Design a protein around this ligand. Sequence first.
Ligand SMILES: O=c1[nH]c(=O)n([C@@H]2O[C@H](COP(=O)(O)O)[C@@H](O)[C@@H]2F)cc1CO
Ligand SMILES: O=c1[nH]c(=O)n([C@@H]2O[C@H](COP(=O)(O)O)[C@@H](O)[C@@H]2F)cc1CO
Lengths: 122, 124
Amino acid sequence: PALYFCGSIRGGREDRTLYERIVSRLRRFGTVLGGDRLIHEQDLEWLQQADVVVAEVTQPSLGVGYELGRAVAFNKRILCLFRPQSGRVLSAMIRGAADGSRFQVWDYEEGEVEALLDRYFE
Amino acid sequence: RPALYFCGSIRGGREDRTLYERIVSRLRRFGTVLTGGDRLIHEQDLEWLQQADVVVAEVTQPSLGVGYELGRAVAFNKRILCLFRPQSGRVLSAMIRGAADGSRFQVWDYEEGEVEALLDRYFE
Ligand SMILES: O=c1[nH]c(=O)n([C@@H]2O[C@H](COP(=O)(O)O)[C@@H](O)[C@@H]2F)cc1CO
Ligand SMILES: O=c1[nH]c(=O)n([C@@H]2O[C@H](COP(=O)(O)O)[C@@H](O)[C@@H]2F)cc1CO
């Protein structure tokens, strides 16, 4: 099962350590998948090849949002992870895109991310 | 007269709110700016996005919602104009910079004082 992970880079790398923890756990469950144009084209190729798109959506990021919008239109299963401890109110576009099944948005505490992913990936 | 959809950060931060108001004021000279909790916001916005002739986004302040709108817009094959200010000190997302094809999806770097003139040139 092919997995695509999204998290902020140019939006800010505040959560980089957490992203590595998520990716580490995702590798147990499946394959974790020129300038900026080449980045965009390669990422779109991988998004089209994914079975599940997982996004850590706590740090606001244009690229993460864009990946999620393309993923929806590519008919992908999506899991978004948001930390209320950030003090932020998550974007209405992401919270409102969720349907609770093929697009899920979960609030979580950092210490529990491994258990949440274990649950989601059954 | 085109139907227009404007994107700019809200929950990402409202740092550029006055500039967004200037952009919308100018867009209104050219066409109609189309503009249940978060679900209703998403659904109504997606209806307007499909109706829009041009999607205009100010992409300087990072925002999940603006990025999402742009991703959905690309998949709807909308004409898209993104406006970015390098004097902000930020580096624009590769996903937005790299999505540009120079015609249907354009990214223009600009200085804040010039936004009305730039919009004039695009909608001329
Ligand atoms: O070099 C890159 N290589 C790349 O794959 N991305 C993709 O876009 C999102 C970050 O978007 P952002 O925060 O940078 O806007 C990530 O989930 C994913 F990493 C972005 C950049 C730089 O933009
Ligand atoms: O109330 C809202 N009403 C709404 O239309 N949006 C749409 O999403 C983008 C901002 O995304 P964000 O920065 O908030 O993530 C805007 O271009 C556009 F405004 C967002 C929210 C709150 O999220």
